[PDB]
């Protein structure tokens, strides 16, 4: 979509695998604010918003907090406390035609600057002079939207770029979007430090004949200590016997 009519995708109730940003080296601009990309697969968020649009190279630098310009003020504005990442790559092969791709537009005039995360698609004739425009164009009466000129021979600053802006919010609500977590192999009959669905401890993991119900995940003994767990990958019940101890 165009930058003035930027499209927003809502990410909710799914494990967020960010390895598609790490592996894919086809990205030109990758800048994060308020959060680090490495410490992102181990952090939860209430919601994640994915904003996508198209601009030129000279305007990619404007997609950042504390920036000014036509794009930052009239098309897409990021707050001063923005917490997220900005990703962009050269899309000259896709968003350029031999006769010039004019399908991507941008707002040229506006009576005021956009608020953070505001989407203005109104085509009201901008009044720049004293004479009021009654919906007609002419003297100091301009159309608010201008079309980009995307040609294959354009300079790198004037070539099209597809931008994706991921924004992370954390409210006083449950967080449904966190991030994947690699698992390791399971070792039986040895003293190990285990972590089952966030429950940690030390003990010997052995096979068991305890018939857990489908909704039951952990077992406990009379002392309220953990007796057994169900392996989250293979639905078998494993006994937890604390590692041998005593006295000499």
């Amino acid at each position, epitope marked *: 979509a165009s930058v003035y009519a930027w499209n927003r995708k809502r990410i909710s109730n799914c494990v967020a695998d960010y390895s598609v940003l790490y592996n894919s080296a086809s990205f030109s601009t990758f800048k994060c604010y308020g959060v680090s990309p490495t410490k992102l697969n181990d952090l939860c968020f209430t919601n994640v918003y994915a904003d996508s649009f198209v601009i030129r190279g*000279d305007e990619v630098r404007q997609i950042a907090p504390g920036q*000014t*310009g*036509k794009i930052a003020d009239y098309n897409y504005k990021l707050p001063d406390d923005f917490t997220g990442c900005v990703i962009a790559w050269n899309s000259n092969n896709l968003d350029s035609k031999v006769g010039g791709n004019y399908n991507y537009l941008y707002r*040229l005039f506006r009576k005021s600057n956009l608020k953070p995360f505001e989407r203005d698609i109104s085509t009201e*004739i901008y009044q*720049a*002079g004293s004479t009021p425009c009654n919906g007609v*164009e*002419g*003297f*100091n*009466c*301009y*159309f608010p939207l201008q079309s980009y*000129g995307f040609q294959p*021979t*354009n*300079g*790198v*600053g*004037y070539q099209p770029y597809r931008v994706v802006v991921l924004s992370f919010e954390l409210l006083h609500a449950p967080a449904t979007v966190c991030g994947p977590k690699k698992s390791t192999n399971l070792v039986k009959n040895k003293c190990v430090n285990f972590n089952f669905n966030g429950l940690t401890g030390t003990g010997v993991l052995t096979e068991s004949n305890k018939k857990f119900l489908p909704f039951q995940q952990f077992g406990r003994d009379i002392a309220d200590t953990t007796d057994a767990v169900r392996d989250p990958q293979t639905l078998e019940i494993l006994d937890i016997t604390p590692c041998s101890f005593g006295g000499v």
Partner: antibody
Amino acid sequence: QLQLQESGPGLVKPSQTLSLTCTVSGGSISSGSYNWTWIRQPAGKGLEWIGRIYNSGSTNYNPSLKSRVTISVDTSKNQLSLKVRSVTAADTAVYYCARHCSGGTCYPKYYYGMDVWGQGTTVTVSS
Amino acid sequence: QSALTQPPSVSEAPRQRVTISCSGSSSNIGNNAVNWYQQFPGKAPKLLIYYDDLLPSGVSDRFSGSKSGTSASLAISGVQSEDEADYYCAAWDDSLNVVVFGGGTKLTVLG
């Protein structure tokens, strides 16, 4: 084929009135949403905005020269003229005429840009 | 008048990048569009960049304009012998009620 043609006397006598012309060819002068301005440039120095004319007569001039300048438009002759009264040696410059677009009926739509310029007539103020 | 200030000359090697800055105040560049013009010796100025960063048809895409705050800059990636001229920045000053032009910048390719 939008071209502007300037004509005027190369020499003007001090304290007398200077008069230039800027004839528009390939179109009409009163068509789009344009500000028809005058600009002079002393040889070796920078450009100086003299004034402008728009709509149907209304004008706005440079305040340092507002009282001595007059900018008219002859629609029948399809030309705009410049009048500079009580000239001095400091008024010796190369004078240009250009059109400044301020609207949506400009072709091409070069907003705020001085689209087409004149070739420039050289005025030398000396007796 | 002299609100917009440009360096008198800037020189760089061929196939390099040159930036021509244009310094003003909040009454012109801060709240009004900035236009750039190219003027060759003995000829009238030619519109090079209009409305801060827009490029007219027929002008090489090696030219590009930018604006941040009360200052503008002109970038010519890939300097060529064809580019030797005087470059002026222009803007309407709200205080002076006047279209203000810079002193001009003379680009001399070095090679």
